[PDB]
């Protein structure tokens, strides 16, 4: 009731548009009240597992800052997204820290990624030198060589183009299929209390 | 699951005032953004105000400052519009449309005539 | 205030045809905040695209949503029968502060 503005959580879940696990998009949530209950209690959520933060007790905690980070991985790689995990994406593209604080909230997205239309192009690294720390963002598309013979910039025999498409168009199993995840971390440090529940 | 269900038409004699009313299900109206949409018969669609139910402070477009207000009730999910002062060239459909903080569509309730008429 | 103007008034075309429906705003908007509704005489409106290219249950995909800061676009790719109505775009937010635009009315060429 201090903050007199509504937290704009809409813009993140509710999105036409997911980015792709190596740009994975961050939102800076502060300042605001959010009703966390319609979070907690929707049925819409394929995978709700929450860490030092009980979900049904949202509304009763005050945080400092709240982030919300957004992509889209394959329906298998959704365990990666979770403290002390390890996988192509835990290691390329998105790693949570082992004192992780927050929800890894998730949903099968066939119905809005994979339609018949197309067009949208969701990627991952395929391959990075040293493991991502916790939160670090990596969008370098140079071509790597791993041979002998310079590069140029163009793909070749060991020339590895760094990402990859996850070829989300077919038909394919409920493991192979795009879902949306949303990391909400509260942070809850020395500042005043800032997005609080209601 | 959510829904928001209006109070059925009205026929008001000039001068008088009405108050429509707006219930909404589904537990998404106290973080929601309730604003009341008026078409009148020919016309196109004219945002009138709205309201945030956990704050309580309504805004106005500016034509309607003076005789409309707008009001919130979280005990019952419901919302209302009360206009003042009608005349004949209020005669329209009133509509609440509604944005939840969680999502980006827009609800809308089915419209409520309002006829000013002796 | 913010000022939604859409172009053109009138939209004269065929079956088949592609429609292209403008929306100018006066300021930079969101477009995690802009909508297009579909009206029918006699009927309410129906809610077509938010959050500027979503597609509201049951909207077919010919009609899609684009645009950015000042400059939206309802495209609708191959003009069926029951398309012919007016349009009307609605800047929004998490504010109370909405505005909508005149409309635009897309008939039959003759």
């Known amino acids: 009731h201090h903050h007199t503005n509504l937290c704009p959580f809409g813009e993140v879940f509710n999105a036409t548009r997911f980015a792709s696990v190596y740009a994975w998009n961050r939102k800076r949530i502060s300042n605001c009240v959010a009703d966390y209950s319609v979070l907690y209690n929707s049925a819409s959520f394929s995978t709700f597992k929450c860490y030092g933060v009980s979900p049904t007790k949202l509304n009763d905690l005050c945080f400092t800052n709240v982030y919300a980070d957004s992509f889209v991985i394959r329906g298998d790689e959704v365990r990666q997204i979770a403290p002390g995990q390890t996988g192509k994406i835990a290691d390329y593209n998105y790693k949570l820290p082992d004192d992780f604080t927050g929800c890894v909230i998730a949903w099968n997205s066939n119905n809005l990624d994979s339609k018949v239309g197309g067009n949208y192009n969701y990627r991952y690294r395929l391959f990075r030198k040293s493991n991502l720390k916790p939160f670090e963002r990596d969008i370098s598309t140079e071509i790597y060589q791993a041979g002998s013979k310079p590069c140029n910039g163009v793909e070749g025999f060991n020339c590895y183009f760094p990402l990859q498409s996850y070829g989300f168009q077919p038909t394919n199993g409920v493991g192979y299929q795009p879902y949306r995840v949303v990391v909400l971390s509260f942070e809850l440090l020395h500042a005043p209390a800032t997005v609080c529940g209601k | 699951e959510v829904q928001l269900v209006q109070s059925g038409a009205e026929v008001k004699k000039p001068g008088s005032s009405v108050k429509v009313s707006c219930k909404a299900s589904?537990?998404?109206?106290?973080?929601?953004?309730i604003s009341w949409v008026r078409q009148a018969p020919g016309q196109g669609l004219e945002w009138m105000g709205g309201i945030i139910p956990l704050f309580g402070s309504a805004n106005y477009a500016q034509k309607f400052q003076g005789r409309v207000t707008i009001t919130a009730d979280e005990s019952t999910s419901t919302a209302y519009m009360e206009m003042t002062s009608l005349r004949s060239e209020d005669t329209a459909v009133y509509y609440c449309?509604?944005?939840?903080?969680?999502?980006?569509?827009?609800?809308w309730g089915q419209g409520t005539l309002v006829t000013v008429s002796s | 205030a913010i000022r939604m103007t859409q172009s053109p008034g009138t939209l004269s075309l065929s079956p088949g045809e592609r429609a292209t429906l403008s929306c100018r705003a006066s300021?930079?908007?969101?477009?995690?905040?802009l909508a297009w509704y579909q009206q029918k005489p006699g009927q309410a409106p129906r809610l077509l695209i938010y959050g500027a290219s979503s597609r509201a249950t049951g909207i077919p995909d010919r009609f899609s949503g684009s645009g950015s800061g000042t400059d939206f676009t309802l495209t609708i790719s191959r003009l069926e029968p029951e398309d012919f109505a007016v349009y009307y775009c609605?800047?929004?937010?998490?504010?109370?502060?909405?505005?909508f635009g005149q409309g635009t009315k897309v008939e039959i060429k003759r």
């Open positions: 449309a509604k944005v939840s903080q969680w999502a980006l569509i827009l609800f």
């Open positions: 589904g537990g998404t109206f106290s973080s929601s953004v």
């Open positions: 609605q800047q929004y937010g998490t504010s109370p502060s909405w505005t």
């Open positions: 300021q930079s908007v969101s477009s995690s905040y």
